[PDB]
Structures are given as C-alpha cells and as structure tokens.
C-alpha cells in the first residue's frame, strides 16, 4: 500500500512550491505511515483487563480509557496526534491557496504583459510603456506585502510545528503509560473491578519516532524559508519590483527571445 | 488513507467560493477523520457486561444501548453527530447549488455582453448602449437580491452550526457515560441481568473535540460572510449595478483591453 | 467515506431537474449513511441468547430472528427499510428517465428549429413559419401530457412517501424490539431453549431518524412539484406552446440575438 | 455502497433498449442488494449447534449443512439462487448481443443510404432508386425475422422467469427451515451429535421479497414486449419495410430535411 | 459486486469473437461467482473435530487437512478447480492471442488492398491487378492453415474441457466428503487426536452446479465450432481466397460502393 | 477477484514480446493466484497447539514457528517462494527493459531512415545510399550483441527457473511439515510446553502444482528462445544487417509501397 | 494484489533515470511485498502470554511488548525497517526531484538552443554563433556541478544504505527474539503475571531476507553510478560543455540532420 500512495508523489517560485510541497507532503505521508502501520497492528490502546474479566469486559476496559484520555496533558496529545499534524498540514496549506487567489490572478497578467512587451522590444530593435509601467511598480508595496504574508505564516507555522513537536517528542518517551479509572457511576462500586486498569498506548512508539523525522525536516526547512525573505539578495535593444524581477527570472524559461539575446550579452 | 482524502483537497466570487468550499469542506473533512478513526478503533459504544455474561449476551447490550439512546437529550447528539454535520454541510452546500441555477445562467451572459462591449469601445476609440443598460442595472435590485439570500442562508446557517456546535462542545464534557437498562418485555424480570449496564459512549471524546475545530473555523468565518455584505466598500475612451462591479472586478483578469488600459492609466 | 460519497454530489428545466435530482438524491444519499453506520456497527440484529448458549447459538438465534422477521407488521418494514427507501429512489428516478427517451427528442428537434428560425428573423429584419408552426403547437396537446404525467408521477410518488414515512416514523417509536421464538421443529421440543428471544433491531433507531428528514424533505418538496402545475404563471423585428415557451425561457441562455435585442427592448 | 451501484444507473428502438436495460438491470441490481445485505448480516445459513460444540464444531454443521443442500428441492433453488437471477440476466441479455451482432451491421448501412437518399430527394425538388430498393425489402422476411428472433427469446426468457420466480416465491414461505444430518461416515456412529441439526436459511426472507419484486417488473413487462410485435400498428417533393419504417421513425431525430418538411407538411 | 463484474461485460470473424469470447469470458465469470460466494461463505473446508480441540486445534485439522489433499483422485480436483476453469480459459484465449499476432498482420494488409483496389474499379467503371491476386490466392493454402490451427486448438480444448467437467460432475456428487488423518511424525502417536477427522469440502457444491452450466454452454459451443469449419458453405463494373472472401463478407459493412452497387445489382 | 485480474491480460519482435510478456506475465499471474486463494483460506501456517493453550498461545506456535523457518532447507524455499517467483518475473524483465533504453532508440532511427529511402525508391523508380548503409551494417556487430544478450540472459534465467522449479517440485511433496520448537531463552525451561510443535505449511501444497505449471511453461518456452538464435534461418526498381532485415520483415506491415510492390512482384 | 503493483511498473540520462528507477523502485516493492505478506499473516510480534491470560491480557503484552521496543539496539531497527527503507526511497529520490528543478529548466532551453542552431547549420551548408556559445560552456562549471551533485548525493545514499543493510542483515540472524517485561507501575507488583515474557518478532525473517536483495542491488549498483563520474570516458558543414555533449549524445534521437549526416559520414 505505502507503495500506492508513495508513486503519486513520485510518479509561483519552485523553491517556494517545494517548501510548500514539502511542508505539507511531508506531514500527509507520515500521518498515512501511522494509519498504514496502526491499521496492521489493529488497536491503538490496550489495557491490563483481570483474567477475570470477559473478552468485552477487557474491550470495554480499553475503548472506555481511550476515551478518558480527556479526563496528564500528553495523554491527551497522543490521541489526537495525527489530528494535530493534519492541522498543520492544512495550516501550511492555506498561504497557497491564499496566494493562488489573492496573488495568482494579478500576477499572471503582470507577467504576460510584461514578456509580450520585451518580445515587442526584441522585434522591433532587430527591425518605454514597461519600464515606466515596472518603474511603477518599484514605487508599490501592495504586492510584495502578499508574497510577505504567505511565507510569514508558512515561517510561523513552522515554528509552532517545531516548537510543539519538540515538547510532543521530549515528553513522549514518558507518557506511554497511563493508569486508567473506569469506577465510574454505579460502578464505582464494584469490587470485582480494579481500582485502575493499567493502559498503554501503542501507537505512541511509532508517533515518538515519526515526530523526530517531522521535527528535523522542518529544522532544516526553517532556513529556507529565512532564505526566501533575502529579496535583494535572491537580468541593450524591497519593492514590488524586486519581487517582479525575481518572478521574471523564474519565467526566463518562457521568454524565447531572452534566451537569443543571453547568448548574444554572453558572446559579447 | 487520510492523505488519500487530503490530496483531493490539495492537488462567483473567489472569497465566496472559499467561504463556500471551507464552510462544506472542513466538515466533510471532519466526518472523514472520525470514521478513519472510528473504524480504527471498531466500535462507537462499550458496556460493562458483568462477567457471566456471553460474548454474544456482552454484544447484545452494546447494540441494545446504541438503540436504546433514543429512549439525557445529549446522548441523542453523540449517536446522530455525524449526520448533523452531514447535514451543515449539505445546509451550507445549498446557497452554492441554488445560486448555480439560479444566478448563474443571467450573470454569464450579462458578463459577456459588458465584456464585449468594453472591447468594442476600446477598438472603436483607438480607430453608450452598455452605459445605458448597466445605468437601467442601478435601477434593478432583483439580481441582488438573489446574492443577499445566498449569503443570508449561509450566514444564518453557520450561526445555527456556531450555536449548535457550542450547546455541543460545553454539554459533551460531561456526558460520555449513561446508564442503559435493557431489562425490557420477558427479559424485564430476568435477576440474572443488572438493572443498569453503564455504557460509554467511544467517539464523544473526538467528536468532542472536532466540534471545538469547527467552532473555532466557523466563529472565524462568521466576520468573513458579514464583509461580503458591505458590497458598495467591497474601474476615457447596493445597487444590482454595484454587484455587476464587484463581479467585473473578479473577471477583470479576462479584459485584455483593460489590462492595457489599465497600465496606460498608471503611467498618466 | 462519507466524504468520498458526497464529493461526488458536489464536485428540462432546472427546477424540475433539481427536484428530480433530490428526489433521487436524498434517499440514496440517506440509505448510504445508514449503511455506512451499519458497517461501523457491525450487525442489524441482537438477541438475549441465554449464557449457555455458545457464540454460534447466540449467533444462531440472531441470524434465525433476522429471518423470522417475516413469520407485527413494522417488523417487516424495519427489516427492508432500506430497499423500500431505494425502491422510492428508482419510482422517483422513472419519470425522468421515461421523460429522457418520450420527451427530449421530440424537445430537442423542435428548439434548435425555433432557435434557428428566431435568428432568421433577427438577421433578417437587420439586413412567419415559425410563428404559424407554434400557433399550431397552441392547439396541440400531446406534448403536455408527457410533461403532465412525469410531475404527476413524480407528485403521486412523493405522496405515497410521504404517507409511508409517516406510518413508518410514527410506528417506529415503538416496534424497536420484538419476542423471537425459535422452537421450531425438532427444537419446538428442547427444554434448554426459552420460550422467546427478545431480539432488538439496531438500525431501527438510525432509520426512524433518516426518515424524519427524508419526511420533512419530501414534504418541502411536494409544493415546488404542485408549483411546476401552474404552467401558465410560470418574451418586433395549458397549451403545448406554453410548455414550449417556458423551455424557450430556460434557454434563452443560448439565443445570443434574444440577449441584444433584450438590452435595445429594455433600453426602449 | 448502494449509492456507488445506483450512480452508476442514473448518471435499436428505445423502447426495447429500455425493456432490455431493465429485463437485465433489475435483477443485477437485485442480486447486487441481496449480497450488500448478506456481507453485512455475515452468514447464508446457521445451525443449532449443541451447546457441547466448539466454535469450529458449530461452524463445522453450518458449513457441512450448506453443502448438505444438495443431497427438498426448494431448498437448492435457495442456495443457487443468486445464480438462477444471474442466468435469467445473461438469457435475457443475449437477444441484445446476438441482435448487435446479426442485426445492427445490417440496418447501419440501410438506414445511412435511406438517409442519403432522402436527402437528396429533399435537396433535388428543391432545386426512385430508394424507392425501389424499400419496395424489395416489402418483399423480403430476412430482416424482421432477426427482430422476432431478439423478442421472442426476450420473451419466453421473461415468462420463464415469471413462472420460475412464481414457483420460488410461492414455497420461499414454507422452505426456510430444514433438518440437516451431519452423522456421515465415520461420524454416523458418534452418540455426542444430534440425530439432525435444525438450520435455518437466512437470506430466503431478502430473496423471497426480492422475487416478489422481481416477478412483477415482468409481469408488468411481458406486455411492453407483446406490444412490440404489434409492428403495423406501431410518414410531396409484418414485411421488413415496415420494420424499417419503424426504425425510420426512432431515427427521425437525424433527418434534418424531414423536421422542415414535417414543418411545411403541418403548416399545409 | 457480481453487477461491477457483470456491468463490464454489458457496458476477425464476429462469430469467431463470440465464441472466443464465450468460451472465455465464461469461465472466468463462473470462476468470480465461486470466488463471490466462498468469500461469503468463509472458508473452503471444515472438519469434524474433537469437542475438545481449541480453536487453533479446529483450525490446524481444516488447514492440514486441506494440505493433505494431495497425500482419492477427485479429492485433489476439487482443490484446485478454480485453477482448471482458468487454465480452460487461458487455452481458449491462446488461439486468439496467437491469431492477432500471427494472421491479423498479414489479413489488414491485404483487407485494405483489396477494398482500394475495389474502389477503384467502381470509380473507373463509373467514369485485373486485384483479380489475378486474389486468383493466386486460391492457390495459397498459407493462411487457412493458420484459421484451422486456432479453431482446431480451441475446438480441442473445448473438447477437453467437456470430457474433463463430464468426469468432474459426475464423479462430483460422490467426493464431497473424505477422511483425514492428521497423525504423522510426532503426533502419529497422539492418543488425544482421533484417527481421522471427518472433513467436508463446503465449495463442492458450487463447483459441481457451475460445472454443470459450463459443460452445457460448451457442448452447444462445440456445434458452433465445427460450423466454422464448413468454409465453402459459409459477392460486373477450401483455399485461402474462400477465406478472404468470408472475410470480405464480415467487411461489407466498411465498403461503400458495394453497398451502392448492392442495391444497384438488387433493383436490377 | 481473478476475472478482475485476467480481463487486464485479456482486454521489438512480436514472438519476442510474447516470449517475455509470456514469460513475466505467466509467474506474476500464478503469484496472483497463490494470493487471492490464500487471502481466502486465510493462514499459512498451522500448529498442532496443546488444547491446554489460549488462541493467542496457540497463534503464538503458528508465527513464532513461521519466523523459525530460517533457524531443512526446502522449508526455507517455501516461506519466500512467491519471492523467487517474483524474482523471476523481475529478472525476466530486465532483458525487455534494458533492450527498450539500450537498442529501441537506435533501432526506431535505423528503422525509419530505411522505410523513406524505401519508399523514396520506390517514388523515384515509378517517376544507392541505403544500400551502402545497409551494406556496412553487415561489416557492424554492435546491435546484434545487444540483441544476443537479451536473449542470453533471458534464457538464462529461465533454464535457473526451470532448474529451481525442477527441485523445488521433486522436494516440495516431502517437506509440508516440519517439527518447530519454541523453547528458546526463558521458556526453553518451560515443561508446560511440548518440545516439538508439528507444524504444517499450508500454502505448499498449491505452489507445488503452481510451480508445475510454470516448469512446463517454461520448458516449453525454452526452444522458442532458442529458435530466436538461428537468425539467418528466420525480402527491382549472423550480422546486424541480418538483424535489421528481420526488425524490416516484423515492420514490412508499415511499408505502404512494399505491400504494392509484392503484389506486382507475386504476379510477376 | 502483488501483480496489481507489479504491472504499473512493467505496463535525463537514460541510464541515470534507470539507476534512479532502480534504487527508488526497489525498495518501495520490497517494502510493499513485505506490507502484502505481513496483512496475509495478520500480526508483527507475538508473546508466550501464560495459559491463564485471557485473550486481550495476551493481546495486551503483545501490543505492550510491541511499544516497549523503545524502552538491545535491533529490535528497534526491526520495528521501523520499513519506515528506514521508506526514508532511504525518499532520499534516493530527492536528487531526481531536485535536479528536474535546478537543472532541468536549463538544460532544456540550452539543448533546443542547440538543435536548432544544428539544423540551421545543416540546412545553410546544403543551401559560429552556437560554436562559441558552447566553447564557453567550456569555461563554466556551474552546471556540472548541479550533477555531480546529484550523483554524489546518490551515491552517499546508497553507500549508507549498503552500510545499514550490511549491519541490519548481519545482526538479523541474531535478535528475532527479546524478553519483554510489562510489569510497570501498578502491576509492577503483580503476582500473576511472568516476570517477562519471550516475545519474538515475525516479520525478522522477511525483512532479514528482503535486506540481502536490497545490499545485492546496491551493491551492483554502486559502480554504476560511479560509472556516471567518468564523463570524460562517457560527434564538416571535467568541463560543462563535456556534459552537454553527453546530453548530446542522448538527445541525437531528436537529431534529423544528425541521422542523415551520420550516414553520410559513415558512407564517406
């Protein structure tokens, strides 16, 4: 199965979709680890049930401490991990989809406009609206503060990430253990039951590890987000500009007659 | 299994249709994430069968107190908590549909026509019947009308869900446990069964929690709905007008004359 | 799952395509929850079965009671409650497909011809067959009776769905649980077995529930089908033709003239 | 699930193709029910075991018995039943293939030249080898026997079925209980196992109801197919013509030149 | 799932296709119908053990015992039946597999030759290369001696198929049950374990009904063969050049003049 | 299940595709039918557990012995059987994949360079730089080693199947069992435990006859590989070029003006 | 299920796309077959729970015993295996993913740059811009780089993953089995329970032996890609151009003029 679900993964800057994909592929891919392997071992809790005690008389045991794990605070984590690493995921997520429709729109037809107006440059030398239009767009911020925002939320996300995956995986080596009270209601007066029921959860071995890989992706995908943030430092016929320009050499790619004149200016 | 739900996920108005897709979409994804777990775990309820009692005769109070919950309200939640947000999703899903068949087919030509007739000002000057007709919009409130009702449904939609959620997620702490006696017809006077069986209640700790998630994202769209309501805040050669504007500012990306005029207008 | 089945459902006239598509919707919608829920719970049946009785005697006498359900009558229905309720779903799917093959061809051929004659006229008084043809429709009566007949099944279905989740919820309250005997037979005589079973139904009080809203949904549904009846409430250069001109109107999205000559009529 | 299956129904004459589709639909969505609900009620059959035997002991009858079916004759209808609808749908559904086959060749190249041959009428006066060529096939038995052939077998399938499902549905009422003697070979000496193990036959209650639905689809369709073989009571510028003539009439839709000339003929 | 499998199948010679297709798609079917019906019922074999034999104990005799098939003749049969039907319809397929790389290169060719040639002969009358080809390939006997290979082979394994499910049916009803001893090495000298556990085949019965309807398909399949081989009973501007001729009749459908010249030479 | 998988089979040399789809296509089948009746009896392994052990004592013997079976021989062959399989299968596609990067582009240039001057001949004839190319691909031994050793080491790894098979086969009927002991480290001191557990590989006895199919298959696949070797013994207006002229006669059914000039040529 | 995976993978240098194929490939079908055998055996680990432990109580130190790995260096190895050969699969995959971002772009303009300026020299000679533009590529490295990154970071991988196989395999034989103590906490004290119970892994044995396939792989495929270093060992009208030509090289397939000047060149 894991073959099935790793093929689709193998079978706007690239640097920042790779961030994104990367950030958000990587917590899916270890969240369908988990389930792969849980659904293979088959339960996530169990219960030291007496020998006394009937095969549902040990279920009710484990299923009602599962839920009680609400009633001490990383037992609580542990239930809901792979909901946590969901919600990062989706919270890595949105600045894309944000981006897509706040920014994807004004961008596309800033970029054509520009190609085709240097292709009309390049043709007509062999044979200035833009610069005055892109000298504009240096003196506008309104852009840039989109492109800002989305890599600031990815950042922060990320720390969060860290930081709670840090506290999540110190910690977690200690609270595979719990002791589990089910002397509730008119059963708490039952003799016949123990006063605790002593409950591991199983899942948590696998979750410990599986933070640890998350933990250092994301250490390591922390400076590249920074990076992104460097602008400035990242082309003869801290504005919006530099961010156009820097859009414009991802698009190099497209403009066919750039290509001509760069080995042209390199001959020369 | 989740990254195989999330990836569809991840690989009119935009802000509307994010509200819309986010108002129908987290809910799924919520229902989603509690039968993945849910069918990890196996079953909804458990009950301390006492220890004579057979696994079938264990199984047969489970089942009899799942039914049982409809003979203390809360515990009428916690068994139909699905189909309710099931049906939020669906309550959210229908300002969509209704607005597809309803507004839709009048807007696209509506649209085409005013596109049309821009560009063949913008050829016309380089070389008012719209005016006039978009002038008559002003005059309309019949289209607006049919956004207003779209977003009202939505909004009073998400209200009830808001308010349902909340009556929810503040009783659900304390109702993980009933007391479920099955001791009904014959078997009313069989001493061998207990009067009561305590039963928990396995998903309420989830759902618990999963009500707490939407809360959150619905309280914060609830502001996100209200701002498409301040539609005249929300371009030489609350009027159905101003909705036609707003519209036309979402389709700006497919005016090619605009874009050039529009750079012509910043350069002057 | 559920989400996998909903997406589907998110990502002639449309009033009537839309009441025939909930129609057939909902109920296949709703029988896939109950399902969805049952394979959750895992079986549709319990019974008391005595403490020695072994797993498959217990699980004899459910099997057998689930059998015996038709040897009182709310009994029968809790157990096919499901094809009923597909069975509503196909009635109600009928008329449009009966509609599809007895009506749209005939439809089809007679548009396209009005559409191309409206045109002719439009590019001609620029530079009355059509018009005598339809006069001629206002005397005919046969294409009514195929609309008349789909709506007036579709309405008589609804009725009758109406009517049996009414007796059907109403009932349900108190037809959960039933006395099952199984001797029967060489075991008529086995002293070892009680007399009765008490067996309960679990699905009984999902299905009761589904079919609230199922009831209510119908029941808003019945005066939007009574409505598509007042046809003639319902355009220079109960007649067939007031059918024909309600489907010109919902395809005035097409008449690319209608659209101009709809902007100089309403500036005039 | 049944959502998935009946999607997939909802999202040559008509009238045949219909009574086809539904001849063979019907009872492939039956028999698709039936196993839906026997994966979720677990078993076909259950025995009282003794509540000496184990588990596999218990199993054991219930298996063995279920083989046992074949060594009383209602008894092995219900086992094989499913099969018996599967036969019926394959033997109604070859009249259809064998017709693709043998017929549908023949009548693409008549209709395609009937067409072009009417076309060319049309354009001609508007500026009798068809003729001729339909006077022969008036002559001509080759064609309309092919048709017989397709109803006739459809036909005589149907009222097979009806019978057959009459006879089932009729004794399903007194045939759901059977003694099964497990004592065989070895075993036959074995004073620890009953005589005979009463089993019950779980699914004939969902079959016995499903033939009844069944069996009125054909009885209801028998004459829809006797309608067909009424052929001559089924057009200015029993023969194999009037066979023609009938799909002439199905393909009237394609006839461009016939719908003005209808027009014109209506008018006049 | 039987319609999933059934739909497929609902939604060169056309004679040869069928057959071929037949006597393929037949078996395979009544393989998956095996498969559906073993996967509802369990397991493939239950035996008789001790009451005081454990679960696993049960378990171990059922799967030994279904090992020791093959430690009479009949019992190993059944094991593998399953195997034999697809071994039928993999030797059935071979001929067609082997005609398409084998025949089908060398009949497009010469197919599309003809047809031009053809052509141009009505388009030239109208205003011998082919015939003297053709004529020479009437002495050829190179490719009917491919046809008669892939009707005689699938001719003779349809003739094994028969004799092989005529001995397997007959032999059927006497092996559904055989004795087996699970005393070897060690525990041959166990006294807790009987001498031999009864154990009974549960899919026999199946197996020996499907075998049935499949000898009955191909003993009408067989007469259907031979006819094929009846090539010279089989178109004015036993040689190779029959079967072209066959051929050119199954190709009619492509040639447009001669159906044309048909109605021509029909009139006259 | 097996239809399933068999209608995908169902619905460069062609004898050399067949050999290595046969080949490879023969063993992943087999592996495929191992599972599917595997899955269906649901273990491979079973243990005669004491009756004094719980079911997870005695599913421990089952696993624990399946893992000993490394700790003789043949034991070891048929725990990781469907690997070898499996391997085969690779290995056999490797000649297939390595030729597709290795000679396929060469070939696919060679090829089409050779048709149009063909056809330019042919062209200028009606109205020699092949021939010299051709003419020193004779002198050139480079592509037919790429060919050799395609079939060299497909040959190859089918004579080690059929040997592997060979003793798999002869030894498989004697080594279905075999004596496991647990008793290592703690519980090697344990005398509750029996020294020996007989257990009884349950899979065995379907790959022996699996692997008698494959060795006939392949023993018949043998001498088709090796007909592949007597290249020289396989065309007017052992060299690479007598391995073109065999890729010329498997292509000739592209050569449009071959298939003319043949005609020509047979009258002639 | 193993040919479901397989034929997806039977139905940029090229040797580089293979060797990263290859070592991706690999282990994602071994971690699958591992996946596919271990649901077909049911668990991972087992435990000699004492005769007296109920099944959960046995359920519970398996599941316990499982967590407790973490809690001597192997057994945790034998835990994540799959997850270790899952990260090795990613990492061998990062200098694909990589590469098509960093140096496809590049390449794929540089190389059509080239081709065509080839063909026009082609087409004028028959009737040196690109000549200096490629000598001084000569003069650059930084796209050599690019490569020899990749390279070298697959290499490394596969180095390290040889090393950790090498000493997973190594140390396999040795530690299929631990003692695993659940008395903790509470039951630290507990009487009844074995001071440790013998707990052997299953799937050891299959991830022993998987291990050997994978170093074998490796192991051959180390040379080949340090075969990739030797570019320099690797076509009249250490340097990044030595690259280029290497692409070159495998881009000739696109090279129309290419073909016919080779065979001149050949005739010549």
Same mark, same amino acid.
């Given at each position: 199965a894991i073959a099935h679900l790793a093929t689709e993964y193998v079978f706007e800057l690239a640097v920042d979709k790779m961030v994104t994909?990367? &950030?958000?592929?990587? *917590? !899916?891919?270890?969240?369908? +680890?988990?389930? &792969?392997?849980?659904? =293979?071992?088959?339960?996530?809790?169990?219960?030291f049930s007496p020998s006394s005690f009937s095969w549902r008389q040990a279920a009710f045991v484990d299923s009602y401490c599962w839920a009680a794990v609400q009633q001490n605070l990383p037992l609580w984590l542990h239930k809901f991990f792979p909901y946590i690493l969901l919600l990062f995921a989706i919270l890595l997520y949105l600045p894309a989809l944000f981006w897509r429709f706040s920014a994807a729109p004004h961008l596309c037809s800033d970029l054509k406009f520009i190609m085709e107006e240097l292709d009309?440059?390049?043709? /007509?030398?062999?044979?200035?609206?833009?610069?005055? #239009? +892109?000298?504009?767009?240096?003196?506008?911020?309104?852009?840039?503060?989109? #492109? @800002? =925002?989305?890599r600031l939320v990815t950042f922060v996300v990320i720390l969060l990430a860290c930081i709670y995956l840090s506290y999540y995986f110190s910690l977690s080596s200690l609270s595979d253990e719990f002791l589990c009270s089910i002397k509730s209601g008119v059963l708490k007066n039952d003799s016949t039951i123990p006063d605790r029921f002593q409950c591991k959860l199983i899942?948590?071995? %696998?979750?410990?590890?599986?933070?640890? %890989?998350?933990? @250092?992706? #994301? &250490?390591?995908?922390?400076?590249?987000?920074?990076?992104?943030?460097? @602008? *400035?430092? /990242?082309? %003869?016929?801290?504005?919006?500009? =530099? !961010? #156009?320009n820097l859009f414009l050499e991802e698009n190099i790619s497209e403009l066919k007659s750039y290509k001509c004149l760069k080995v042209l200016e390199n001959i020369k």
């Open positions: 994909c990367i &950030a958000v592929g990587l *917590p !899916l891919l270890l969240i369908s +680890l988990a389930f &792969a392997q849980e659904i =293979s071992i088959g339960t996530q809790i169990s219960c009309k440059v390049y043709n /007509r030398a062999i044979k200035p609206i833009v610069e005055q #239009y +892109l000298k504009t767009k240096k003196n506008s911020s309104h852009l840039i503060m989109k #492109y @800002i =925002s989305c899942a948590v071995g %696998i979750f410990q590890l599986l933070s640890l %890989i998350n933990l @250092i992706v #994301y &250490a390591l995908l922390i400076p590249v987000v920074v990076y992104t943030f460097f @602008i *400035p430092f /990242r082309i %003869i016929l801290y504005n919006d500009l =530099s !961010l #156009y």
